[PDB]
């Protein structure tokens, strides 16, 4: 499910550390 989570975060422009 990390697949969808990462996509959603990408879609929102969230900053990854």
């Amino acid at each position, epitope marked *: *499910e990390d697949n969808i*989570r990462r996509l*959603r975060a990408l879609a929102d*422009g*969230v900053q990854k*550390v």
Partner: antibody
Amino acid sequence: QIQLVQSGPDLKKPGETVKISCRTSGYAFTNYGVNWVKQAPGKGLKWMGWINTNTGQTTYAEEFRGRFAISLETSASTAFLTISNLKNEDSATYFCARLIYDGDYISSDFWGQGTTLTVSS
Amino acid sequence: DIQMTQSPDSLSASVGETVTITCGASENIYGALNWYQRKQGKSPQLLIYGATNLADGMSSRFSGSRSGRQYSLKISSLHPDDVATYYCQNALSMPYTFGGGTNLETKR
């Protein structure tokens, strides 16, 4: 130590504008998001919006899209919440929190102490 | 927008007892769920992230689980300092909406 220090409490008249500040320290400001949470008296937490501290991109919950603006002063590691045309319903305590995303999960891991706004004649 | 339904509104339990708070997501949120603890007069504190992961510096007496669209916060053994309001939060897609919150009190 990681800290988010907000500006003090304020009393405003309806129709006026308030700018609440969130001064951060203890980490690389532009590697983490900042998001704002509203808590009206006797009500729960309400997520208001987020700003990308790197790109400046913002996103708001529907309820707050109009009169609410999140902005930055990057050189001072500070974020601001500006509320325009204040209404009595805006009386609440506002929190800023650091938004961290570790590549798997997203959360508000560090919080400011809160800012209590009263709107009144 | 995702709507979070938290249950129950308030909860009372004896010390040492196990307590369970639940959250229902209006849609599948793929395990992206946070729990925050709000002690009286303090700022919310991250308690659980990713549905099941204990946040730094929080008691191991707290754990989280998931069943479909039902998320659970569990306290294995209640202590008096656990009294607080607990909030779940959608953390998948913005807006990261909170549940209505749950007031936890102690029976003594």
